[PDB]
Design a protein around this nucleic acid. Structure first.
Ligand SMILES: [Zn+2]
Lengths: 482, 734, 49, 745
RNA sequence: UAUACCUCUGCU
RNA sequence: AGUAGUAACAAGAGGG
C-alpha cells in the first residue's frame, strides 16, 4: 500500500470486465407504460377502530366545554333522547364468532349502565364477555425442555398477508370524509394577541382555513380518534385488570354556535398489561348505525350486527320510518397505535401547509395577499375528482378537505403496505413529472420498480384505493397528453 | 467547612464505599458517574403520555417529604415512599409540583435576568422593536453560514472556559493566564453583575458558555444577515413575504460600514446606466435609507473610505476621507484608493504579525514636524519618496516613517528580534506602530538591507546613502532628497471625480463589481430602483413586468420598437450585464428581432420576452455570434442561452409558467403562446434555423464556422445543448 | 491540588499567580518559595532560575 | 363524482405537492418478535453476494471466513462484493492528488486527537454490546464493566487516564487464555416469620477460553430496526462491542476530518449546508461547461450498501490514507478494519414455538439453532437454518465479508466520493465528465457531455467503475433526467423546494418534561417556518394544537376551565391565589402567550414581568427538590432522531417544572438487581466529591489519584485558609477528623 | 392436578 | 374470537 502507485489499473480492469455489466438507459414515456397491477381475492373488509360514514349519534344540547362532565353521565343523557328501542336480534352474523355472546354482551352492558353509580364503570367478568375480550387465550409459557416432544409444536405462522381485492366502499368513505357538515368539530386553544402585521394577516388567513376545515367530516373522525385513543390509553394504563366501559363521545357546535354532545356507542376495554409498544389491548366496539350491513356485507366481515330499534325520518317530499342497528365487534390496539391516534390533529397541519403554500406561491407572483381571492373569489380550478363527464375541478376550500381526508385516512389506515407503496410510487410520479417537464427521463430497470411498488399492494383498502388513484391519474395524464 | 468532613467520615466508615473512594481514581470517577442501569428512552413522547396517566410518575429528592406535606388540602397525595430505581429518590405526584408553586418556600431571584441575560436580551430587542408594513414578492434566499448568538463577546472556547472558571470557580481554577482586557473586563464585569445571585453554579457556567462563545449555522436568508436579524428570520421573512422590522438596540459600526458600501455601490452602478447619472444618484441618496436611517445623514457622519461611497460623498458635497496621520506625520492621498487585505507575515525573527496590507498604486502628500515628502506607493512597494526638511535628522525621521509605511518585504526581513512595545495605558500597539517604534530605536539593519540605486544627477535633487551621507548620483532604493491645502474636488454629470487640476481621481467604472449580501436592511424609496434588493429580484421583476404588460409591449414591438427598447424599466437589468457587452448584446438582439419581422411567418414571443431586456442599450455594428448572454449575479456569471431554456430563463409548459432562477414570474398569455408552430428565426445573425440537421449537407459545423457560406446555402450546425440543426444563410441583410 | 493551593493562597492575599509551581509558602512573610538543590555550585542555578 | 387527490398532479408539479406522498401522520411499522430471521437473512445474503470468494478457516477462531476482495470480476448486474484493491488505491490516490496535503492535516489532527483523548470520551455515545453480560448496555457501564474485568485480570494501563492506554490493553487481553469474569445467578434462601422461601442473587466466578473471549470481543449484536418508514419489510441493525469502539472512534474521527474538507461529501453537515453543496456543484458544473453541451442528473441509490462493503478494503483505505505517517499511528487505526474483517454476529433472541392442540408456547435461544430438530420450522426458515449452520460458531455466526447497518460510518462515504472525484475533466479526459454529492448509499450525480450517447458512456463508465470497488447502483431505484430536477428526501426543482411532511412527527409533546417540552415545541414550529416553508397561518394553528396537546398530556389545563383531572383542584387554588394571572406558566394553568413573534423566547423569560413575586420565587426556587443537578455538558439537552440518533439542545430556565419521570423498574425482578445499588453507591461518592470539587461538574477533573486522597488534601487547606485568612478549635476538629479517617486504611 | 388468594413488573 | 403480518400479542415472573 505504501509503495503503491497507479499506472492504469481501473482502465485495465474495465477492459477485462464483462460487457454484460452495463447501465442501459431506457427512455421513459408515460403514454407507453402500463397501469399498476391490483391484487385479486376476497374483497377488503373495513378495519377501522370505529364507524366512519355509517356511524350514528344520539346527541344532546349541552353548554359544557370540550371534555367537561362525566362521560358516562353524558352517555346516559344521550341514551334517553332515543325512544324507540327494541329487543335485540341478530340480522348480520360474524361468521367466525359465537354470535350469541355479542347479544349477551349488549344486554349486559345496557343493564350495567342502567344500574350504575359514579364515574367509572367496570363490567363483571362473564364468560361471554371473557370470550369477546380474549381472556386466557394466551398459550401458557413453558421451558422448551418440558415440551420438546410435542407433535404439532411449530413456529408461529409467518407467511405474508392474504391478498384482498378493491371494493367500492373505501372510495365512498373518502368521498364522505372529504365533505362539509353542519357542525364545528374542532375547538382551538387561545393564542397570544396579534401585534405584527404578518400576525394579523396570519389570523385572517387562519380564519378561512378554520372555516373550511372545522366543519369537514374528516375532522369529526380526528376528534373521535383522539377521544377514543386517549380514553383507551389512560384506561389501559390505570385499570389494567378491569373491563372498563368507555362511551364514544364527541363535543361540537351547531351552525348556531350551540354546544352539543354526541354519543356514537360504547367501547369495552379488556385487560391491558401492556409492556412492549406493540402489545395488544383487546376491546369490544358497540356502535349505532342506520346502514343495513347486508347491502354491503363484504364491508362488515369482522362485525356482528344487531337490530335494536326504530325511528322516523323525513325526505324532501315523503317521510318514512327506518330501523336502527348496532354494529358490535371485537377489536384490538397497541400503545404505539393509540399514541399516534391521540396525535391525529397534526393531520390539520399537513393539509393546511400544502394549501397555504399554494396560496403563498401565487401571492408571490401576483405581489399581493391572494387569500381572500382564493377563498372568496369562488373559482373551480383544481382537479380533484373524476365523474362520468370527466375530470372535475374543485375550489381551494375543497382541496383543503380532500388533503385533510388523505392525511386523516393515512393515519386511520396506517400500514407497512402504505409505507412501501407511498415510497416507491413516488419515484414513478417523479419520472412522469420529469417527462412532463420535457427533461428527457430515463430508467435502468423499470419493471424492477413496478415490482417494488406492486409488492406493497396486498390487502389494505386504503393502499388499494391509492393504487387505483395512481392508475386513474396515469390514464388521465395519458389522455390529455397523447 | 464541617458537615462535608463529617459526611465523608460517616461514608468512609462503610467499607462498601471506602472501597470505591480508595480504589477508583479521580479520572475513573468520571466513568463511574455515568454508570447507570437506565436506558436512553427511545420513545419519550409515548412514554410520557403513558406515565402521566399514573399517580406518581415524577421522582424527587427525599427531602421533599420534609419540605411539603404528604396529603394536601383536597386530599391529593403529593409524595410516596417508593424509591426511584437506582436512586435515593422518591416517587411523587404532579400535585407536588403545583403545591410547591402555590405554597412552597419563597426565594430571592430578582437578579436571575443577569444570569439568563442571553434570553432576556431576546425579549429586550423584541419589546423595543418596531414593525413596518408587509411586502409581498418573490423572496429569494441565500443558504449561508451566519451567527446565531447575538451579543457574542467573541473569544475562543478555552478562552471562554478560562473566564467562566474565574467567575464561578475562582479557587478551583486551573492554571492558565488571562490573555488581555478582553478576558479581564468580562471577568470583572460578570463577577460584578453576578454578585451573590442565589442560583446553581452549573446554570451560571452553562449560561455563560452559551453566552460568550460564537455559534454559527447554515440558514436560508433574504436580506439583512446581522445576528439580531438572524434571530427573527421566522418573523421577518416567508416564502412570498417580507415583514419589515427593526429590532430594539443600536446597530454596529462594522455592520453599518459594511452595508453602506453595498448601498453606495448599488446606487452608483444604477446611476451609471441612467441618463444624467449624477441626477439619478443624488435622488437615490436622498430617498434611500439604511436600517431606517437617512443614507445622507450617515454619509455626513461616516468615515468610510470606499470608491462608491466617496463618489456619493463627492456628489453630496461631503468631504472624502482622503487624509489621516501616522508616526506623527500627516498623510493626504492625492490619487489611488485604499485596497486593503488582511494577511499574516513573518518578521526577520520569524515572528508572525497580522497586517492589513494595502494594494494598488497610491500617491501621498506627507507633511509633519519639520519635514515633508511626496510618496508614491505600490503593493508593499516604495516606488518613490521625495523628501525635504529643515534638518537632515528631520528628513531621516520621515524617511524611516515612510520606509515603514511602505510595508516592503525588505523592511520586514530586516526586523531582528521580537516586537513587544506597549502604549502608555498598557495597550499593545498595532503592527504598523510596533514596526515603527522598533526601527525608530534601531534602524541599523534596515538601511543595510534596503539597497541602493545609481541615479542621474538633477539640480535640486540629491540621494542619501545608508551611512547617512548625501550623494549626488547614488541613493537608497526609491528615496530622493529635495528642498499643502484641502484639495477642491469636482464631479461631473457622468460621476467622474476630478481634482481642480482636471485630473481623474475616481471613475465609476473602477468601482468594484462585488455583490455582497448586506448586514443591515437597505431600503430604497426610488422609482429608479425595484422594490426588492439583489440581482435575482431585478431578473424576476424585469421578466414579471414584461408578462404583466405583454400585450401592450407586443404592439410596441411592431410599431415604434426603438421606443420600446429605451423603456427605463429595462435599466436595472442592464447593471447585471458587463459594461463591454451591452452594446453588442443589444445590437445582436435588435437585429435578431428585426429578422423576425423581415422574415414573415416566423414568430416566437417567448424568444422575444426572453431577449427583450437585453435590447436596452445603444447597439454596436459588430457581426459576432452568441450562443448565450452572460449575467453577473452574486459573483458567479450565469449564461442565459439564446436558444431554448436555461437556468436563468425557463419556460415550463406543464405549468405554463416562466421560471427565473427557480422562481415563477408568472404564466405567459393564456395559451396563445403554447400554440406557436413555426420554423425558427431570431437565433442567429443572418441565418435561419430550418429544423433537424440533414446529413446530405455534409459534416456538421460550429457557430465560429459560419462566415464561409453562400447567401442561400444550407448547412448543419451544432447550435447548442448537444443539438444539430439545419441552417440557411438569408439573402437580404437586416 | 497544588494549583488549588496556589490559587487559594493568592485569592486570600494580594499575591500574583506564579507561572510555574512553587514548592513551599511562608505564611508570616507571605512569600511563595521555590527550593533549588543542585550538584553544581550555586550562582549558576540561582541565575538560571 | 369520485374524489382522487392524486389528480392534483395534473395541475400542480409533483415536487410542489410532494407533501401528499408522505403518509407521516400514522404509526410507522414495528417488529413484534425477533430479528433472528432478519439477521440470518442478512448473513446469508452477504455471503451469497460474495459466493465466488475464497473460504478459509481462521486460526484463532475456526470461523468459515469468506474473502471476495481481489476475487473474480462479476459478469451480471446483480449485487456483488468483488472489489479490487488496486482499483481502490487508484481512487484513493487520485483523491490525494486532487486535494494537496489533505491527508496530511487530516492525520495530523487525528494524531493530536489520539494523544489528547481521555478515556472519559468513551462514556459518551450510543449503547454498546457488553461482552461481559452478553447484552447491550449504555457505553458508560459497558466500559466500566470491561475496565473492572481488565482490572480483576492482569490489565491496568488505562489507569493512566488516556484512551490509547486503555486501547492498548484490549490487544493484550487477547493473549490471556483464561479470562476471569464474575456471573450473577438467582439463589433461593429460607426465611422465618414471627416459614417462607426467599429469592436472592449470588455471584459465580467463571473463566473463558481464548476461543470464547476472542469471539465475544469480535461479537456484534443484532436487532430489528423499528419505526422505519418508506419500507414494507423490516431490516436488521447491528450494535458494536466495547473492544472495537475505541478504534472505530479514531477511524471515524479521521474519516470525518477527511469528509469535512470535500465538496462531494454529504457528511457530516446539515440539510441547509447539504443543499448549499448541491447548489455549489450545479453552479460549478454549469459554469465549467460550454453552451453546446448536455447535462444530466441521476437521482441515485446504491443497493445493498453495507452488505457489499469490505473491511479489508477499509484496511487498504486507512493504510493508504496514513501513508507516510508514524507506524504506531498507522497500526492503531488499522485495528478496526481488521476486527471487522474477523467479525462475528449474534443472532438475537431466537424463536418462539406454539402448540395449537396443547395451547402452549415456548422460547428457544439462538445458540440452540446448532442443536435443534428442523420439524418445527417452515421452508424458508429451515432452509436459512441450513445455510447458516456452516458459518455458525459458538452461538454467534461468522461475517467476514460485507458490513451491517449501525456498525461503521463516514469512511464508506469517502469511497463514494473518490469515484465522484474521478470524474474531473482533468482526470477522465474523455468526451464526457461528471461530478456530484454523496452520503452513504444516497448520491446525486451530474454527468456532462456533448451528446446523449456521450452521457450513456459516462453512466456506464461510472456504473462499472463503482462495481470494481464493490459499489452497486440500484437500477430499480435510481433514475436519470436532464439537469433541472432531482437527494435524501430533499427535492430540487430548479432550486430546492419544501418538504414539510417529513417533519410532521416532530410536531408534538416530546415528553421530556413540562419545561423542556415547551421550549422544544415552540422551536420546532420556528425552525420549520424558516427551513421548510411552514406558513404564518399554519404556524399559528401549530401553536394552538401544541398547547392543546401540552395541556392535555400534562393535565395542566387553564385555571379557569371546568375540566376535572387530578391536578385541576391544585391548579385552581393557585389560579385564585394568584393576582397577575398572565404571569402563570401553561404548566401552572396559565394562558398561552405565544404567537409568531414569541417563538424564540422561553416561557419563563416571556412572562417574567407579569409574575407574582411569590410565585416566581417558588417556581425558580433553586432549593427545589424536583430538579436534579445535571452537569453543564448535559444541561438543557434532549435526544431526537431524524439519521440514527442525535442530541437536541433547548433554551429554558430551570424551574420546578424541570423534573425527570420515574425510572423503569423491570430490572428489580432480574439478576442484575444489584446494578441499582452500584448506581446508588457510585452516585453518593460523586455527590460528596463535588462538595470538595464544585469545578468537577463543569469540566471533568483530570487526575490520577485516589478519590479520597484528593478530597482530604483539599479538606485540609480549605479548613486552614478558612481560618488563617478568614476558629482554631474548628480547624483542629477538622484536621483531627481528616487524620482520624486517613488512619482507616 | 384444580380452585382461590398474595407479592414484583408495564421500554430493561 | 380479535389484534396483527415474514412474528409476535392475546399478561410475564415469583410465593414450586
Ligand atoms: Zn384545553
Amino acid at each position: 500500500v505504501s509503495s503503491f502507485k497507479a499506472n492504469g489499473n481501473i482502465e485495465a480492469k474495465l477492459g477485462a470486465m464483462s460487457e454484460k455489466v452495463n447501465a442501459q438507459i431506457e427512455s421513459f414515456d408515460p403514454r407507453t407504460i402500463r397501469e399498476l397491477e391490483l391484487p385479486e381475492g376476497k374483497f377488503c373488509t373495513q378495519r377501522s377502530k370505529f364507524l366512519l360514514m355509517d356511524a350514528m349519534k344520539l346527541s344532546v344540547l349541552n353548554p359544557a366545554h370540550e371534555g367537561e362532565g362525566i362521560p358516562m353521565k353524558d352517555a346516559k343523557a344521550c341514551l334517553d333522547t332515543f325512544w324507540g328501542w327494541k329487543k335485540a336480534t341478530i340480522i348480520k352474523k360474524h361468521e367466525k364468532g359465537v354470535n350469541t355472546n355479542y347479544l349477551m354482551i349488549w344486554e349486559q352492558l345496557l343493564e350495567s349502565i342502567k344500574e350504575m353509580e359514579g364515574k367509572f364503570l367496570n363490567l363483571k367478568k362473564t364468560n361471554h364477555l371473557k370470550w369477546g375480550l380474549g381472556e386466557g387465550q394466551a398459550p401458557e409459557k413453558m421451558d422448551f425442555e418440558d415440551c420438546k416432544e410435542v407433535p404439532d409444536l411449530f413456529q408461529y405462522k409467518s407467511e405474508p398477508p392474504e391478498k384482498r381485492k378493491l371494493a367500492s366502499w373505501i372510495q365512498s368513505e373518502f368521498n364522505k370524509a372529504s365533505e362539509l357538515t353542519n357542525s364545528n368539530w374542532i375547538e382551538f386553544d387561545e393564542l397570544g394577541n396579534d401585534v405584527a402585521p404578518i400576525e394579523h394577516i396570519a389570523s385572517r388567513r387562519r380564519n378561512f382555513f378554520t372555516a373550511e376545515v372545522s366543519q369537514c367530516r374528516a375532522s369529526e373522525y380526528i376528534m373521535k380518534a383522539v377521544y377514543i385513543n386517549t380514553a383507551l390509553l389512560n384506561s389501559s394504563c390505570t385499570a389494567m385488570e378491569e373491563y372498563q366501559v368507555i362511551p364514544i363521545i364527541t363535543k361540537c357546535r351547531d351552525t348556531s354556535g350551540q354546544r352539543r354532545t354526541n354519543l356514537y356507542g360504547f367501547i369495552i376495554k379488556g385487560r391491558s398489561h401492556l409492556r412492549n409498544d406493540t402489545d395488544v389491548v383487546n376491546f369490544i366496539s358497540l356502535e349505532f348505525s342506520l346502514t343495513d350491513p347486508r347491502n354491503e356485507i363484504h364491508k362488515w366481515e369482522k362485525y356482528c350486527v344487531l337490530e335494536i330499534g326504530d325511528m322516523e325520518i323525513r325526505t324532501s317530499i315523503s317521510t318514512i320510518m327506518k330501523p336502527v342497528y348496532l354494529y358490535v365487534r371485537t377489536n384490538g390496539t397497541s400503545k404505539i397505535k393509540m399514541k399516534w391516534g391521540m396525535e391525529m390533529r397534526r393531520c390539520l397541519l399537513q393539509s393546511l401547509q400544502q394549501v397555504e403554500s399554494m396560496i403563498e406561491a401565487e401571492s408571490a407572483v401576483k405581489e399581493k395577499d391572494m387569500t381572500e381571492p382564493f377563498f372568496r373569489n369562488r373559482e373551480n380550478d383544481w382537479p380533484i375528482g373524476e365523474s362520468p363527464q370527466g375530470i372535475e375541478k374543485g375550489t381551494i376550500g375543497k382541496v383543503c378537505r380532500v388533503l385533510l381526508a388523505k392525511s386523516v385516512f393515512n393515519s386511520i389506515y396506517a400500514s407497512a403496505q402504505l409505507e412501501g407503496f407511498s415510497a416507491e410510487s413516488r419515484k414513478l410520479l417523479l419520472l412522469i413529472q420529469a417527462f412532463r417537464d420535457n427533461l428527457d427521463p430515463g430508467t435502468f430497470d423499470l419493471k424492477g420498480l413496478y415490482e417494488a411498488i406492486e409488492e406493497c399492494i396486498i390487502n389494505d383498502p386504503w393502499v388499494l384505493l391509492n393504487a387505483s388513484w395512481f392508475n386513474s391519474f396515469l390514464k388521465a395524464v395519458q389522455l390529455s397528453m397523447g | 467547612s464541617m458537615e462535608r468532613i463529617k459526611e465523608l467520615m460517616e461514608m468512609v466508615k462503610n467499607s462498601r464505599m471506602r472501597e470505591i473512594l480508595t480504589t477508583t481514581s479521580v479520572d475513573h470517577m468520571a466513568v463511574i458517574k455515568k454508570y447507570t442501569s437506565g436506558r436512553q428512552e427511545k420513545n419519550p413522547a409515548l412514554r410520557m403520555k403513558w406515565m402521566m396517566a399514573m399517580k406518581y410518575p415524577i421522582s424527587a429528592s427525599s427531602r421533599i417529604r420534609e419540605m411539603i406535606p404528604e396529603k394536601d388540602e383536597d386530599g391529593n397525595t403529593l409524595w410516596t415512599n417508593t424509591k426511584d430505581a437506582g436512586s435515593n429518590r422518591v416517587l411523587v405526584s404532579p400535585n407536588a409540583v403545583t403545591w410547591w408553586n402555590r405554597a412552597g418556600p419563597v426565594s430571592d431571584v430578582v437578579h436571575y435576568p443577569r444570569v439568563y441575560k442571553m434570553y432576556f436580551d431576546r425579549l429586550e430587542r423584541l419589546t423595543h422593536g418596531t414593525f413596518g408594513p408587509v411586502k409581498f414578492y418573490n423572496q429569494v434566499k441565500v443558504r449561508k453560514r451566519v451567527d446565531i448568538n447575538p451579543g457574542h463577546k467573541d473569544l475562543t472556547s478555552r478562552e471562554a472556559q478560562e473566564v467562566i472558571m474565574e467567575v464561578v470557580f475562582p479557587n478551583e481554577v486551573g492554571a492558565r493566564t488571562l490573555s488581555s482586557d478582553a478576558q479581564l473586563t468580562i471577568t470583572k464585569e460578570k463577577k460584578e453583575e453576578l454578585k451573590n445571585c442565589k442560583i446553581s453554579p452549573i446554570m451560571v457556567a452553562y449560561m455563560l458558555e452559551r453566552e460568550l462563545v460564537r455559534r454559527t449555522r447554515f440558514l436560508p436568508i433574504a436580506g439583512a444577515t446581522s445576528s439580531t436579524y438572524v434571530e427573527v428570520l421566522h418573523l421577518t421573512q416567508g416564502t412570498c413575504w417580507e415583514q419589515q422590522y427593526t429590532p430594539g438596540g443600536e446597530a454596529e459600526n462594522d455592520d453599518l460600514d459594511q452595508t453602506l458600501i453595498i448601498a453606495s455601490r448599488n446606487i452608483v452602478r444604477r446611476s451609471i446606466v441612467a441618463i444624467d447619472p449624477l441626477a439619478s444618484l443624488l435622488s437615490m441618496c436622498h430617498t434611500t435609507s439604511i436600517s431606517s436611517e437617512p443614507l445622507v445623514e450617515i454619509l455626513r457622519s461616516n468615515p468610510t473610505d470606499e470608491q462608491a461611497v466617496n463618489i456619493c460623498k463627492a456628489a453630496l458635497g461631503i468631504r472624502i476621507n482622503n487624509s489621516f496621520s501616522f508616526g506623527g506625520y500627516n498623510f493626504k492621498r492625492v490619487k489611488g484608493s485604499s485596497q486593503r487585505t488582511e494577511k499574516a507575515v513573518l518578521t526577520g525573527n520569524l515572528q508572525t504579525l497580522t497586517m492589513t496590507i494595502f494594494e494598488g498604486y497610491e500617491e501621498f502628500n506627507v507633511s509633519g514636524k519639520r519635514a515633508s515628502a511626496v510618496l508614491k506607493k505600490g503593493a508593499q512597494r516604495l516606488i518613490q519618496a521625495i523628501i525635504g526638511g529643515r534638518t537632515l535628522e528631520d528628513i531621516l525621521n520621515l524617511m524611516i516613517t515612510l520606509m515603514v509605511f511602505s510595508q516592503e518585504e525588505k523592511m520586514l526581513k530586516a526586523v531582528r528580534g521580537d516586537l513587544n512595545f506597549v502604549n502608555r495605558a498598557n495597550q499593545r500597539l498595532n503592527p504598523m506602530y510596533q514596526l515603527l517604534r522598533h526601527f525608530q530605536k534601531d534602524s541599523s539593519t534596515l538601511l543595510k538591507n534596503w539597497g541602493t540605486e545609481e541615479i542621474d544627477p538633477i539640480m535640486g535633487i540629491a540621494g542619501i546613502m545608508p551611512d547617512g551621507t548625501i550623494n549626488k548620483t547614488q541613493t537608497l532604493m526609491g528615496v530622493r532628497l529635495s528642498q499643502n491645502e484641502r484639495i477642491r474636488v469636482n464631479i461631473d454629470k457622468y460621476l467622474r471625480v476630478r481634482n481642480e487640476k482636471g485630473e481623474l481621481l475616481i471613475s465609476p467604472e473602477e468601482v468594484s463589481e462585488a455583490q455582497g449580501q448586506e448586514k443591515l436592511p437597505i431600503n430604497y424609496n426610488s422609482s429608479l430602483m425595484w422594490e426588492v434588493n439583489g440581482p435575482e429580484s431585478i431578473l424576476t421583476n424585469t421578466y414579471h413586468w414584461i408578462i404583466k404588460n405583454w400585450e401592450l409591449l407586443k404592439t410596441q414591438w411592431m410599431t415604434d420598437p426603438t421606443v420600446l427598447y429605451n423603456r427605463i424599466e429595462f435599466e436595472p437589468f442592464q447593471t447585471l450585464i458587463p459594461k463591454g457587452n451591452r452594446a453588442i448584446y443589444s445590437g445582436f438582439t435588435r437585429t435578431l428581432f428585426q429578422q423576425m419581422r423581415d422574415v414573415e411567418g416566423t414568430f416566437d414571443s417567448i424568444q422575444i420576452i426572453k431577449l427583450l431586456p437585453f435590447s436596452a442599450h445603444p447597439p454596436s455594428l459588430g457581426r459576432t455570434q452568441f450562443s448565450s448572454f452572460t449575467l453577473n449575479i452574486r459573483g458567479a456569471p450565469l449564461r442565459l442561452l439564446i436558444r431554448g431554456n436555461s437556468q436563468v430563463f425557463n419556460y415550463n409548459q406543464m405549468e405554463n409558467v416562466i421560471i427565473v432562477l427557480g422562481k415563477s414570474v408568472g404564466s405567459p398569455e393564456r395559451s396563445i403562446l403554447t400554440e406557436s408552430s413555426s420554423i425558427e428565426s431570431a437565433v442567429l445573425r443572418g441565418f435561419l434555423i430550418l429544423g433537424k440537421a440533414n446529413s446530405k449537407y455534409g459534416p456538421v459545423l460550429t457557430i465560429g464556422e459560419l462566415d464561409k457560406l453562400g447567401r442561400g446555402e444550407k448547412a448543419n450546425v451544432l447550435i447548442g445543448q448537444g443539438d444539430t440543426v439545419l441552417v440557411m444563410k438569408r439573402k437580404r441583410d437586416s | 491540588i497544588a494549583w488549588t493551593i496556589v490559587n487559594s493562597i493568592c485569592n486570600m492575599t494580594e499575591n500574583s499567580k506564579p507561572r510555574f509551581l512553587p514548592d513551599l509558602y511562608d505564611y508570616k512573610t507571605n512569600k511563595f518559595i521555590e527550593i533549588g538543590v543542585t550538584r553544581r555550585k550555586v550562582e549558576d542555578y540561582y541565575y538560571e532560575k | 363524482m369520485d374524489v382522487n387527490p392524486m389528480l392534483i398532479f395534473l395541475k400542480v408539479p409533483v415536487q410542489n405537492a410532494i407533501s401528499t406522498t408522505f403518509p407521516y401522520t400514522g404509526d410507522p411499522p414495528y417488529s413484534h418478535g425477533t430479528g433472528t430471521g432478519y439477521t440470518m437473512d442478512t448473513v446469508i445474503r452477504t455471503h451469497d453476494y460474495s459466493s465466488r470468494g475464497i473460504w478459509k478457516t481462521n486460526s484463532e477462531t475456526g470461523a468459515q471466513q469468506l474473502n471476495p476482495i481481489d476475487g473474480p470480476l462479476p459478469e451480471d448486474n446483480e449485487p456483488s462484493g468483488y472489489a479490487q484493491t488496486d482499483c481502490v488505491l487508484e481512487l484513493i490516490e487520485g483523491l490525494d492528488r486532487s486535494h494537496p496535503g489533505l491527508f496530511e492535516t487530516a492525520c495530523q489532527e487525528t494524531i493530536d486527537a489520539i494523544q489528547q483523548t481521555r478515556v472519559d470520551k468513551l462514556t459518551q455515545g450510543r449503547q454498546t454490546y457488553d461482552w461481559t453480560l452478553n447484552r447491550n448496555q449504555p457505553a458508560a457501564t459497558a466500559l466500566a464493566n470491561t475496565i473492572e474485568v481488565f482490572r480483576k485480570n492482569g490489565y491496568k494501563l488505562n489507569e493512566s487516564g488516556r484512551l490509547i492506554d486503555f486501547l492498548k490493553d484490549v490487544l493484550l487481553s487477547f493473549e490471556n487464555d483464561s479470562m476471569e469474569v464474575t456471573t450473577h445467578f438467582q439463589k433461593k434462601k429460607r426465611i422465618r416469620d414471627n416459614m417462607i422461601t426467599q429469592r436472592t442473587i449470588g455471584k459465580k466466578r467463571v473463566k473463558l477460553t481464548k476461543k470464547n473471549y476472542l469471539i465475544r470481543a469480535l461479537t456484534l449484536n443484532t436487532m430489528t430496526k423499528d419505526a422505519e418508514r418508506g419500507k414494507l419489510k423490516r431490516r436488521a441493525i447491528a450494535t458494536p462491542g466495547m473492544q472495537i469502539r475505541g478504534f472505530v472512534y479514531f477511524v471515524e474521527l479521521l474519516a470525518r476530518n477527511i469528509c469535512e474538507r470535500l465538496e462531494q461529501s454529504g457528511l457530516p453537515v446539515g440539510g441547509n449546508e447539504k443543499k448549499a453543496k448541491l447548489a455549489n456543484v450545479i453552479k460549478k458544473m454549469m459554469a465549467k461547461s460550454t453552451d453546446e453541451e448536455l447535462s444530466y442528473t441521476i437521482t441515485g441509490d446504491n443497493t445493498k450498501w453495507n452488505e457489499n462493503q469490505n473491511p479489508r478494503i477499509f484496511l487498504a483505505m486507512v493504510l493508504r490514507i496514513t501513508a507516510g505517517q508514524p507506524e504506531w499511528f498507522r497500526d492503531l487505526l488499522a485495528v478496526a478494519p481488521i476486527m471487522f474483517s474477523n467479525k462475528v454476529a449474534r443472532l438475537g433472541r431466537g424463536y418462539m414455538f406454539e402448540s395449537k392442540s396443547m395451547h402452549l408456547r415456548t422460547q428457544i435461544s439462538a445458540e440452540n439453532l446448532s442443536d435443534i430438530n428442523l420439524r418445527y420450522f417452515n421452508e424458508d426458515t429451515k432452509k436459512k437454518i441450513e445455510k447458516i449452520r456452516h458459518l455458525m460458531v459458538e452461538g454467534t455466526a461468522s461475517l467476514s465479508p460485507g458490513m451491517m447497518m449501525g456498525m461503521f460510518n463516514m469512511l464508506s462515504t469517502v469511497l463514494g466520493v473518490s469515484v465522484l472525484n474521478l470524474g474531473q475533466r482533468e482526470i477522465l479526459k474523455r468526451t464526457y465528465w461528471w461530478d456530484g454529492l454523496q452520503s452513504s448509499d444516497d448520491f446525486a450525480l451530474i454527468i456532462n457531455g456533448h451528446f446523449k450517447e456521450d452521457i450513456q458512456q459516462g453512466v456506464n463508465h461510472f456504473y462499472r467503475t463503482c462495481k470494481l470497488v464493490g459499489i452497486n447502483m440500484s437500477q430499480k431505484k435510481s433514475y436519470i433526467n436532464k439537469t433541472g430536477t432531482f437527494f435524501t428526501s430533499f427535492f430540487y426543482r430548479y432550486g430546492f423546494v419544501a418538504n414539510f411532511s417529513m417533519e410532521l412527527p416532530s410536531f408534538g409533546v416530546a415528553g421530556n418534561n413540562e419545561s423542556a417540552d415547551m421550549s422544544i415545541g415552540t422551536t420546532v414550529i420556528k425552525t420549520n417556518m424558516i427551513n421548510n416553508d411552514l406558513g404564518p397561518a399554519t404556524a399559528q394553528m401549530a401553536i394552538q394544537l401544541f398547547i392543546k396537546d401540552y395541556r392535555y398530556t400534562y393535565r395542566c389545563h387553564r385555571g379557569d376551565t371546568n375540566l376535572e383531572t387530578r391536578r385541576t383542584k391544585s391548579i385552581k387554588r393557585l389560579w385564585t391565589e394568584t393576582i397577575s394571572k398572565a404571569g402563570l406558566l401553561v404548566a401552572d394553568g396559565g394562558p398561552n402567550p405565544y404567537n409568531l413573534r414569541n417563538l424564540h423566547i422561553p416561557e419563563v423569560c416571556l412572562k417574567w414581568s407579569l409574575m407574582d413575586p411569590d410565585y416566581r420565587g417558588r417556581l425558580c426556587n433553586p432549593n427545589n427538590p424536583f430538579v436534579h443537578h445535571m452537569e453543564v455538558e448535559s444541561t438543557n439537552l434532549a435526544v431526537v432522531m431524524p439519521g440514527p440518533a442525535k442530541s437536541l439542545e433547548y433554551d429554558a430556565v430551570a424551574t420546578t417544572h424541570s423534573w425527570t419521570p420515574k425510572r423503569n423498574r423491570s430490572i428489580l425482578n432480574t439478576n442484575q438487581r444489584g446494578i441499582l445499588e452500584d448506581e446508588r453507591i457510585y452516585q453518593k461518592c460523586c455527590q460528596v466529591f463535588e462538595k470538595f470539587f464544585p469545578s468537577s461538574t463543569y469540566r471533568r477533573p483530570i487526575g490520577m489519584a485516589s478519590m479520597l486522597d484528593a478530597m482530604l488534601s483539599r479538606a485540609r487547606i480549605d479548613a486552614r485558609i478558612d481560618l488563617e485568612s478568614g476558629s482554631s478549635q474548628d480547624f483542629s476538629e477538622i484536621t483531627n477528623t481528616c487524620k482520624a479517617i486517613e488512619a482507616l486504611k
